[PDB]
Structure formats: C-alpha cells, structure tokens
Amino acid sequence: MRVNITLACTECGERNYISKKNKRNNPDRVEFKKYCPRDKKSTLHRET
Amino acid sequence: LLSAHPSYSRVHITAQAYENPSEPPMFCMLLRKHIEGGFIEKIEQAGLAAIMIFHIKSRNEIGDETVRKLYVEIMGRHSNIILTDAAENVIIDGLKHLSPSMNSYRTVLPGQDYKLPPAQDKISPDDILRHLSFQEGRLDKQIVDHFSGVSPLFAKEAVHRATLPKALLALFAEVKEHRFIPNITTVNGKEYFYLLELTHLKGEARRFDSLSELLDRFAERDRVKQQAQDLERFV
Amino acid sequence: KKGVGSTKNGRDSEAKRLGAKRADGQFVTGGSILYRQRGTKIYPGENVGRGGDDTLFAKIDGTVKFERFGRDRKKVSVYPV
Amino acid sequence: MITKTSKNAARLKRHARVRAKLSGTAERPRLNVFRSNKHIYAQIIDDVNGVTLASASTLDKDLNVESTGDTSAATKVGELVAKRAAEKGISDVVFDRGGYLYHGRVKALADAAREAGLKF
Amino acid sequence: RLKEKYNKEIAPALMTKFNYDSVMQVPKIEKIVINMGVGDAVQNAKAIDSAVEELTFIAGQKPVVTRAKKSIAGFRLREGMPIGAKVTLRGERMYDFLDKLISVSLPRVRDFRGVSKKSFDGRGNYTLGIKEQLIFPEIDYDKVTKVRGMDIVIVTTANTDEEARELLTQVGMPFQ
Amino acid sequence: MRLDKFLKVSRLIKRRTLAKEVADQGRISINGNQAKASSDVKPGDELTVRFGQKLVTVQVNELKDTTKKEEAANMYTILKEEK
Amino acid sequence: MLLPKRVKYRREHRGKMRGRAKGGTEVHFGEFGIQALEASWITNRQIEAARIAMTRYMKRGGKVWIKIFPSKPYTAKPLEVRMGSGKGAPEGWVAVVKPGKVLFEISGVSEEVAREALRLASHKLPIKTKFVKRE
RNA sequence: CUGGGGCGGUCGCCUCCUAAAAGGUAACGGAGGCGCCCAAAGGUUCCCUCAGAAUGGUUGGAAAUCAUUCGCAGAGUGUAAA
RNA sequence: UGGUGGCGAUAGCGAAGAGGUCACACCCGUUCCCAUACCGAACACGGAAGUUAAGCUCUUCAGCGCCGAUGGUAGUCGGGGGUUUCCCCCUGUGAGAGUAGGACGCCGCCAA
RNA sequence: GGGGCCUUAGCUCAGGGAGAGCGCCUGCUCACGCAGGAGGUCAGCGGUUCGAUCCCGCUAGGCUCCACCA
C-alpha cells in the first residue's frame, strides 16, 4: 500500500522530511540522504 | 494397451498401435516420471481376482535403481489403474481418484498407503456339492457366491451341461493348463467371447490363435454411436 | 405527463486562461510571463526561459518579439535596449 | 544486401546533441574539434558571429612530427592553440567534444590546453 | 580457414564472373545469426535455459535471450516474456562456425539431399533451418533434454539473390 | 448457510428436495441435537446422519455455492460410520 | 434505407445550410443528372424512394450514381415530453444539401427517359430541382 | 438545482467540443476521466530511434524470436482527452 | 578541398554522369586506454598496403516533393434591402483550391 | 414511460483463461442408486486489453419497484 512516511536524521534525531512509499515494494525501513538544516549537512535520514 | 474404461476395461497387446496423442496428459507424464525406461521384472495375478500387478524396476533421477508395483484393478464399472511403492505400499499415482465419501473400505489418493478391495469369501478355484444346496436352483447365479473368477456367461454355459461338479473341475483344469480356445461368440448379435468356446447356445463362433487378437478384433466408439444415433433421429 | 433524465454529460473543467499575456514590441520586466500554454505551441528564444508548466518568462527586462523557427514553428525573444 | 551509415553523420547528430546546450561567445567561445583518421584539427569560435579566432592542426607546418593522429600530436596541437588564444588573451573558453568521447586524443588535447592556461 | 579462402579464391572468382570494377563490390559474409524460438518456455523457464545451453555449445558464444515485442493472445505470450535465444557471430567466430557448418554438421543432417537455393530473402541473405541440434558434434544425446532445432541466417552485403548465391556457391555450399 | 443447500453443494445428497425430505423425517442431527433443513451451519460443525440403518458422522470445514464437483468434498470431512 | 455503419458521435448539432455546394455540382460519372435549386435535409427513405422509382421506370436502365450519403443523424425526443433532460435520441439519418448540388445521375439511357425518371424522383423529393446534362 | 413540485439524476476537480480565430462565456447541452501511481516510471551523464509492410523463412501457426529493404512517425509518451 | 556556422526543403527526394597525388572517407589489425546486453560492427587504440565502388564534392533534369504570384470567386467588418430554416445590393477587404511561373542552393569565418 | 436486477447446457441455476443439480445416452443396476459422455453465442452489437461470461458503453427480452398532487 502507498503510505506516508517521515524521514528523520540520525545525528540530529530530527524528522525534517516527509514522503510516501509502497509497503509492498519498499517494506523495510527506508533511508535516504538529505540536508539537515541543524547539522547543516547532507546526512543520512531514516524512516520511523 | 491397458484400459480402465468401465465396460471395455481390460488389458491387451495390439498390432494396432492406435494413435499416440498430441497432448501428454497428467497421468501419462506421471507414468513417464517414475516408470519410463522401466524393466518388467514380474507379473502377478492378484490371487485370481480381476486384478493384475507388474513388479517393475527403473533407475531414479540419480541412477540409483528403484522399484514399484503397478496395479490394474478391472472390476467393471469401477475399474481403475494405480501405481504404488514396493516397500512402503504408498500410492504415487492414480487414474480414478476416489475419496472416502463413498464410505468405502479402500482409497486411491496418492501418498496414502495402498490397499486392495475386500476379497470376498469365495474359494477362488465337489466343494459346491458340499457347501451349496443344489436344491437352490438358478445356481449359475450362486457359483459367483463360491468362486472368485466368474461370469454369469461362464456360469450359465457350465450349468447348462446337464449335479455337475465335473464340468467345473474339468474347465478349471483346462484353464490351469491354458487349454482354452480364444474365440468370439455371436448369439444373434450380442457378440460375446471368453477363454472357453461357446458351450451350448446357437451363436456363431470365430476362433483365434491369440486372446490378444481376439480382444483386438472385438472409450469413444460408443460416444460416436451416441452422436450418430442422435443425428439419425433428427434426420 | 412522463418522466425522463440521465444526461450524464453535464460537466467541464475550469477555464485556464492560457495564451499570450504580453505583446510584441511591449516592454517587459524581469520574470514576467509571456505565453501560458501546455506543451510547446511556442518555444523560448533569447533571454527567455521555460517552466515546469511549459510557460514562458523573461529572464531580463526588454522588448518582446515573436518569430519563427524556420518552418511551422514559433519563437519568442526578449531583446534589451 | 546490407546498408551502412556514415559514422561522420552519426558524429554530427551527437555533435548537435551537444551543441543544443552551448554556443561560443566573446569571452566564452567554443572550442571545436575534428578527428580525421590521419589528422586532428581544432578551432576556437564565436558562434554568435560565426567566426573562428584561432586554429591548430597536425597539418600546421610548425612542429611537424611522425604520428599526426596519436595523443602526442593531440597534446602538441593543444598547447599550440593555447598559446594562440593566449596571444589573443581570452584565457576562458568552453569545450566541444564533437560527438566524440572525452577519453582519448580529445582528452589529451583538452588537458594540454588546461595545463597551458585555458580555463573551461 | 574460410576467411583466407574468401580473400584468396572467392574474391577472384566473383570479380571475374560479375565483372566488378572494385573488390569492395564483391559480396562479403557480414554476420551469422543463429536463433532458437522456444515458445514452449512460457510453461517452463527451465526449458529456455537448456536451449540456451545448446546454443552456447554450438556457437561457442553466450546467447542473448530474446523476448516478446508485444503481447500475442494466440500464443499466450505477454510483452517482455522470454521466448527465444540468439547469437550473432561475426569475424573469426563466424568463419569458424561457417567451416564447422559446411564441413561437419551439414553432412550429419539425416537424409541430406542438399540445401534449398530458394531460401534467399530477395536481398542476398540466406536463412536455413536445422531440425535436430544433434548434427553439431558439440552436442551429446545424453546432454540433450529435448529435440531442439534452430534457424541459421547468413547476412551478406550482396545486392541481389544472384550475387548471394554465387557467394555461397564459391564456398562449396551444398545447394541442390 | 442452510442444511439442505449445504448437503447439495457438498454433494452428500443429490437433490435439495431429498435433503428437505430427510430433514423433515428428522433422520439426521447436528452436535447431538435434532435439526431441520432451515437449520444453520458453519465451519467446525459436527453432523450426524442416517441412510436407513447406515449412520454417519462428519465434520464441516468450509461452505460455498458455486461448488464444482471435486471441490465439493473439500467442504467437509468424514469422521465415522456405524449401523 | 442507407446507413453509415459506424460513427464517432451518434449526436451532432444540426447545422446551417448557407451558401452553395462545394463539389458535386456537375454530372461527371453519368450523362443526364438532376441538381437542386434550394437547400434542405434529405433522408434515406426519400432517396430510396426516388431510386426505386427511377429504376422501376427504367427497368434495366444503365447506371444511376447517387451522389450523396446520409451521414448526418438527427434526433427526436419521445412524445409528450417537457423540455430539457438531455438531448433526444437518434431517429434516422440525413444528407445535407446545398443548391447547385447534383443528387442523382443517369447513364446508359436516352434523354427523354432520363428526364421522366428524374421528374418522378423530384416529386418524391421536397425541393426544387433542375434537369442537367454533362458538358 | 429542477423548463411547477415530487420521484429520477446531479452536486468537487481535470480534458475536448459548443466557444462565434485573444481571454472568458450558460443550459437536466454533447463526449470522457480523477479521488492515483513510480524509490524507479525521479535527477544527471552518455548512448539510439519507433509503428506496420513485404520478404526470408525448421518448430512457429493468421499471429512468437529471428534477418533484409521500405520506411517524419501510422508507434510510444504510467493513466482520460487536448 | 576540408572543417565550422547562419537562412522556412527555392536547400530536399529521385535518375544520370565525372574526381580523390594532397585532403575527407573507404580501408587493415586489436598490444596496450576503452569497448562491446553478443560484437574491435560501432565506440576507442595504433597503421597506411589498396578503394573510388560507397560516403563526400562538381555537373546536369522539373518525374516526386517544396515555394508561389496576378486576375477571378467564396467568405466577410460596415451600411441598406427583401417573398427571411435564407437570399440580394453598395464602398472596402480578401483567402483556399487551381494556375502563370520559380527552384535540384544563398550567405559567412578558418586551414592548404 | 423512469430506476434497479437478470439473460450461461434441454429446464433450474452457480461462476480477466465454462461449473452444478435436474432430464437424455450408456454400463453397473423389476426399480432406484452409482460411474462416464453429450448438449455451451456466456441475449445481441460495439469497445478496452495480449486476452473477455467477468471490465466499459448501447440495444432486445424478462422480472421487481415507482408512475403522484390538483
């Protein structure tokens, strides 16, 4: 199913981003890299 | 040829290799799986019931030799062909799967331990004058009630020989000695055939050298006949 | 009297006010849009840019001129003073 | 039967695919390249005016060598055109791999010009 | 071997016969394409791979699995389903397969009475079918899973069927 | 579903008419209780039946209407026979 | 009763019969034809009436070449109905006609026979007509 | 809302026609779609070019996959239409 | 000649011919860079024995496609009229199609 | 006339790659039961899709409900 997601940092712990995904095609806790405006860097973000 | 076709169920060897199909069916392919390139060690009669066994050998998919027991039960309307394991006696294949919804003794389905039908309480081979009261009459019926391999045809033709244990013993010795004569009888049509010749009736007789050729010259023919008659009515 | 209905053809979308918004020889500011469209009835040219909505805007100030990409194909451009 | 396309025409299509993204101006001209089987040519262009400014080649009578077609020749012609565009003190350009790769002789030439002073 | 035979005998014979001005007008063998249509692999994918194995053995080359260009309901195939395999032989491998084909495998065709000189495409390319893969000795009956055939296309730079058949007859191709 | 419908779809009884008839005779029962053709049934039900003297006990696994011939017997299991 | 086999839209606007025809203004398939002097819609029943009329008058005669086809449909709401509630259902099929337009032609037959047949057809048609021949 | 009301049908958004060569423009006027999808179906770099035809032909046939010339485009463009 | 740009195919398609010592291609082999869903075909790498066939240039033509007048007509703003589901008159404008004809190229920069 | 549901074996009727029971034929078995085969436009037309009982639209038939206030 296509479902909303937040994508929190790992250094900062902050959420910072939202998106959506298939639970079927992308079941696992996904992760990307985005800009943390507190860490002021590209940084791996993780789903909750 | 093997046939579990109910009225025409039999076994045969035919010069007429009729027609190998374009479709390999499930049962055929299952036989190919476990019997192809086989080796017919032995044949057995199943204790004179209308049933036969082939003890067969063949190498498995790793070249290790294995064996199996192919069973052919020709009962009439409820004949069947079954394949079974040698030691485990477990059914592996089956032509007419039969669920225990018929509340029957035995069962067909694969995986299950094979079992044979209930063999009736009939002395398969004077003993009739001992057990059966010849006053009963219509004893062509009740020779079935004493012997295993019986037709009412055979019973009638033997009973018409007129106390006749002699006929039974002589004909049993004949069959045991393979002394029979494979012919086809025709009593005004209704073409019948049997190991022994015709005994009394008016029917014509044509004899053969092979029971197999007898069977040859004697599943779908009847269907075509149904279609033909249904059309003929309309015409 | 009788009874009838079921037209099921009774709607349409909201009109989106496409076309040109500035004219040839007209002075233009930076960032002004020129020709709303869908796809490219018209392409950009000099000092002109296309957006995600296939809309055409002036990157600078200047005067507008419409022309042709050779055959059967049009163009705009902004030329300053 | 069979039929065969001119790889030059292919190269022209690839060249145009590139050219759609750029064009040579004054103070940002275009450096175009040609890659004959026996020679290699280079030019520098103001595509606005449709004018070459400087040029270079193995065919140039200066620095005549044996290869005229390897990376050494490419390097030599690159530094030559670089000093040409130095004495016409532009020093800033754009490159045009004309439907070729930035892999071989082209790459060597471009690197030569980078080292000689021209800044892409 | 056959490339040298081409460069040294086939080119003189064709230049003399057709009165060509340039040697570049002489028709060349451009490529050999071997294909198997394995449409019976929609039921079993393991049948696709074993036909792929025979092709690898015959050509000495890993084959490209071909797939359906569009959905075809008569054959039960969806677009993108893999129902064939092919190799494109060029240069040395093509000449070596061509020698193995002319000198070894075509003599092992059952009841070989010659190849059809009709099987040109109207442009100079020659297509033939092989009914049993067993004609190639790199194939063993024990290895064989099913009786596979294949088709073999010889693509040539000839402008007509006359020129193509002359090019093939120059190698001693066995036309009836 | 109803008992008569269930018997027909499971092909225990060949006619809904006959199923009604035998349930109105009360020759059968469910979970040790006498039942009727309109009696409700479900998975996990334990059914007792008679065919003259032939007494039968069976277990319900599933129910449906479309019931193709061989799939009918998946609907239930025989447990036992008596007379 | 001619019919277009297939159509995009079963329901069309009616239109306007202004001006003269584009083409089909002169006989060229046949010899002796008829043309119009007005504008109107014409129906498959009208054209087949005229057709069978001339063919009965001629009884073997040559060739005809109608020059039209009722492509247009026309709707009509059911009876005793208020206005609105959608467009009416189709009823039949129609050919639209401008003046100067040739409708029927004739060849293989003499002038007098042709003129009489076309007269008969005109009386089945609604509009004013003229007898015409090829130049 | 309603060519009286009621019952029916519809109620928001997108595309086309009506629409009158800017734009806009109604009707219980005509045709159709949406209440999503893709973690690659996005970005970038680099690459190349389709649909059909005939024609070749082992399987394989009308119709696979194969090879040839013809082929601005008849194909494709996640989905309706422009 | 080659390279490289500009102008709506008046540039193209198609047919016929001519040339290549330089040049451009075509051509010849993969040891390296790199590469080929398979591939030294292509892309790359190096080479120059032979090839003008083909590509590329130069000539020719009007068969296809392309451009395209004048005049006339439809249509039409405006004005007016009439037996007004339409038609007519006047000033003015004015196509398309069909022709006349044009055209198988114009302009630049660099290198020998 | 409007709205909804349905139209599949001879009858009754279930159900994005044809089923049951009933009735016919057959053997088993007087009279039932039990095992096979037959009979199929998935009402018609058109459309989508590779592919239609199935999804979409129109049409024909049947049934049910409504067809009113003056």
Strand F33-34 versus strand F46-51 pairing type = unpaired
- Answer whether residue G27 is part of any domain: yes
Q: Which residues of C touch G (CB under 8 A)?
A: 1-2, 4-7, 9
Look at residues E142, E40, E50 and name the one whose alpha carbon lies nearest to residue B24.
Answer: E40
Q: Is residue C78 part of a domain?
A: yes
* Ramachandran region, residue B65 (left: φ > 0; alpha: ψ -120 to 50; beta: rest): beta
Angstroms from E50 CA to nearest CA on chain D:
33
Distances in whole angstroms, Cα of residue B43 to Cα of each of B39, B69, B70, G63: 11, 10, 10, 87
Distance (Å, whole) CA B64 – CA B29: 21
Give the Cα separation of F69 and B205 in Å (integer): 45
DSSP string computed for E72-102: BTTTTB-TT-EEEEEEEE-HHHHHHHHHHII
The DSSP-derived string for E40-74 is GGTT-HHHHHHHHHHHHHHHTSPPEEEE-SS-BTT
- Residue B100's nearest CA partner among D17, D63, F58, D40 is F58
Question: How many domains in chain C?
Answer: 1
Chains that touch B (3 or more CB pairs under 8 A): F
Q: How many residues does chain E have?
A: 176
Which residues form the domain of C41?
18-81
Question: Cα–Cα distance between B85 and B81 in angstroms, integer?
Answer: 14
Q: Which nucleotides of H are covered by protein (CB under 7 A)?
A: 2-19, 22-33, 36-40, 46-48, 51-52, 55-70, 82
Check: CB of residue E140 under 8 Å from CB of residue E79: no
Domain presence at residue D102: yes
**Cα pseudo-dihedral E46, E47, E53, E59, rounded to 10:** -150
Cβ contact B14:B212 at 8 Å = yes
G81 closest-nt by C1' vs CA:
J1
Burial class (CB in 10 A: 0-12, 13-18, 19+), D85: buried
Q: Is residue G134 part of a domain?
A: yes
Q: Is the dihedral of CA B129, B135, B139, B142 positive or negative?
A: negative
Which amino acid would we find at residue B177? E
Q: Cβ–Cβ contacts within 10 Å for residue E4, how many?
A: 10
If we measure between CA atoms, which residue out of B123, B12, B17 comes closest to residue B74?
B12
Is residue G117 a contact partner of residue G131, using CB atoms and an 8 Å limit?
no
Spatial distance between the Cα atoms of B171 and B184, rounded to a whole number of angstroms: 18
B192 forms beta bridges with B185
Dig out the tokens for B109 from the structure. 């389905």
In contact, E42 and E80? CB cutoff 8 Å = no
Asked whether residue G3 is domain-assigned, the answer is no
Quote the minimal CA–CA distance from G22 to chain C in Å.
Answer: 28
Give the number of other Cβ atoms within 10 Å of residue B227's Cβ: 10
In terms of Cβ atoms closer than 10 Å to its own Cβ (0-12, 13-18, 19+), residue E56 is: middle
- Residues C64, C77: Cα–Cα separation, whole Å: 6
Query: Position of tokens 């620095």?
Result: D63
Tell which residue, F61, F12, F51, has the closest CA to residue F28.
Answer: F51
Residue closest to B105 by CA, chosen among B120, B90, B93: B120
D111 touches strand I (CB under 7 A): no
Residues 34-93 of chain D sitting with CB below 7 angstroms of strand I = 34-39, 41, 43, 45, 47, 50-52, 55, 57, 59-61, 66-67, 69-71
Tokens matching residue G105: 């032609």
Per DSSP, the three-state class of C4 is coil
Q: Residue G88's CB: how many other CB atoms inside 10 A?
A: 14
Nearest to D82 by CA among D47, D53, D39, D51: D53
Please give the order of strands across the beta sheet that includes A31-36.
A18-22, A2-8, A41-47, A31-36
**DSSP percent split of chain B into helix, strand, coil, nearest 5:** 30, 20, 50
3-state secondary structure of B129: helix
B-F contacts at Cβ under 8 angstroms: 10
> In degrees, to the nearest 5, what angle opens at C-alpha D21 toward C-alphas D18 and D26?
105
| Cα–Cα distance, G115 to G127 (Å, whole number) | 16
Contact yes or no for C2 and G86 at CB 8 A: no
Residue carrying structure tokens 């759609």: D20
Å resolution of this model?
3.2
**Beta carbons of G85 and C7 less than 8 Å apart:** yes
F34 with F49: CB under 8 angstroms? no
- Residue among G108, G105, G104 at smallest CA distance from G60: G108
Instruction: Give G82's contacts in chain C (Cβ within 8 Å).
Output: 1-2
Helix or strand (DSSP H, E) at A10: none
The span from the CA of E174 to the CA of E103, in Å, is 10
CA–CA dist B103, B110 (Å, integer): 18
CA of B227 to C1' of J25 (A): 9
The separation between CA B74 and the C-alpha centre of its own chain, rounded to angstroms, equals: 4
Phi, psi of B166 (to 5 degrees): -55, -45
Q: Which residues contact D49 (CB under 8 A, 6 or more apart)?
A: none
E167 touches chain D (CB under 8 A): no
Rounded to 10°, the helix B152-159/B165-176 angle is 130
F67 CB burial (10 A radius; 0-12, 13-18, 19+): middle
Nucleotide nearest to E20 (CA to C1'): I53
DSSP-derived secondary structure letter, E118: T
Which residues of chain F neighbour B99 with C-beta distances below 8 Å? 73
The Cα B100–Cα B84 span in angstroms is 19
Under 8 Å between Cβ of D45 and D30: yes
CA distance B190 to chain F (A): 34
Count CB neighbours of C25 within 10 A. Answer: 9
Amino acid at E106: L
Cα three-residue angle E166-E169-E170, rounded to 5 degrees: 85
Round to a whole number and report the distance in Å from the CA of F56 to the C1' of I21: 111
Burial class (CB in 10 A: 0-12, 13-18, 19+), B9: buried
Chains F and G touch (3+ CB pairs under 8 A): no
> CB-based burial of residue B14 (10 Å sphere; 0-12 exposed, 13-18 middle, 19+ buried)?
exposed
* CB hemisphere CA count around B154 (13 angstroms): 18
Residue D98 lies in a domain: yes
Domain positions in chain F: 1-83
Residue C51, CB half-sphere, CA atoms under 13 Å: how many? 14
C36 three-class SS: strand
CB contact under 8 A, B103 and F81: yes
Instruction: For residue C60, give Cα distances in angstroms to B123, C45, C65, D28.
Output: 115, 12, 14, 20
| Domain membership flag for residue G59 | yes
Q: Is the Cβ pair G85, C9 closer than 8 Å? A: no
Domain extent for G82: 23-135
Dihedral angle, C-alpha A12, A15, A17, A20, nearest 10 °:
130
Q: For chain D, how many structural domains are there in total? A: 1
Which residues lie closer than 8 Å to D2 by C-beta, 6 or more apart? E30, E124, E155, E156, E157
- Encoding tokens for residue E140? 């063993």
Closest partner residue to C5 (CB to CB) among G80, G85, G87 is: G85
Query: For D59, how many CA atoms within 13 A lie in the half-sphere containing its CB?
Result: 12
Whether G16 maps to a domain, the answer reads no
Pairing of strands G102-104, G32-36: antiparallel
**Residue span of the structural domain in which D40 resides:** 21-120
Domain count for chain G: 1
Of F12, F54, F78, nearest to B100 by CB-CB distance is F78
Do C and E touch (≥3 CB pairs < 8 Å)? no
Give CA–CA dist G75/G14, Å, rounded.
Answer: 9
Residue G88 near residue G75 (C-beta atoms within 8 A):
yes
**Measured distance CA(B82)–CA(B108) in Å, rounded:** 7
Could you tell me which residues are beta bridge partners of residue A6? A18
E6: Cβ contacts below 8 Å, ≥ 6 apart: E28, E29, E170, E171
Per this entry, what is the length of chain B?
235
End-to-end CA distance of chain G: 32
Give the bridge partners for A20, in sequence order: A4
- Method for this entry: cryo-EM
Strand order in the sheet with G102-104: G102-104, G32-36, G129-133
Please give the DSSP secondary-structure letter assigned to residue F2.
B
Q: Which of residues 58-117 of G touch strand I (CB under 7 A)?
A: none
Picking from E52, E46, E131, the residue whose alpha carbon sits closest to that of residue E85 is E52
- DSSP letters along chain D, please? ------HHHHHHHHHHHHHTT---BTTB-EEEEE--SS--EEEEEETTTTEEEEEEETTSSSS--S-SSSHHHHHHHHHHHHHHHHHTT--B-EEE--SS-SSSHHHHHHHHHHHHT-B-
Domain assignment present for D116 = yes
Using DSSP, state whether B94 is helix, strand or coil: strand
Tokens at D2, concatenated: 């069979």
CA distance G87 to chain C (A): 8
Helix (H, G, I), strand (E, B) or coil at G69: coil
Domain boundaries, chain A: 1-48
Q: Give the C-alpha separation, E25 to E17, whole Å.
A: 12
Residues of B with CB under 8 A from a CB of F: 99-101, 103
